[PDB]
Amino acid sequence: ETLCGAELVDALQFVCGDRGFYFNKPTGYGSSSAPQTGIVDECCFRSCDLRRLEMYCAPLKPAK
């Protein structure tokens, strides 16, 4: 059905891997912030798909 609490973190840990993850979707400057909203709203309170969930993975960088 949905992903919450520990299940949500396990999912984020598995999908994101070494990259790590975050919970609040970015908003961008001099904007509004429905206050601070993110993955709980998208994947726990409601149903989300893999592509949505993967948007909460942090970058990788790299550096050459």
Swiss-Prot record:
In this chain, the stretch annotated as B covers 1-27
Q: What is the effect of changing residue 46 to W?
A: Found in a patient with primordial dwarfism; uncertain significance
Q: Where is this region: A?
A: 38-58
Where is the chain membrane-spanning?
A: none
* Cystines in this chain: 4-44, 16-57, 43-48
**Span list, region C:** 28-37
Ranges where the record places region D = 59-64
> What does the UniProt entry say about where the protein is found?
Secreted
**UniProt similarity note:** Belongs to the insulin family.
Q: What does this protein do?
A: The insulin-like growth factors, isolated from plasma, are structurally and functionally related to insulin but have a much higher growth-promoting activity. May be a physiological regulator of [1-14C]-2-deoxy-D-glucose (2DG) transport and glycogen synthesis in osteoblasts. Stimulates glucose transport in bone-derived osteoblastic (PyMS) cells and is effective at much lower concentrations than insulin, not only regarding glycogen and DNA synthesis but also with regard to enhancing glucose uptake. May play a role in synapse maturation.
**Self-association or partners: how does it assemble?**
Forms a ternary complex with IGFR1 and ITGAV:ITGB3. Forms a ternary complex with IGFR1 and ITGA6:ITGB4. Interacts with SH2D3C isoform 2. Forms a ternary complex with IGFBP3 and ALS.
Linked disorder reads: Insulin-like growth factor I deficiency: An autosomal recessive disorder characterized by growth retardation, sensorineural deafness and intellectual disability.
- Protein name in the entry: Insulin-like growth factor 1
Q: Which gene encodes it?
A: IGF1
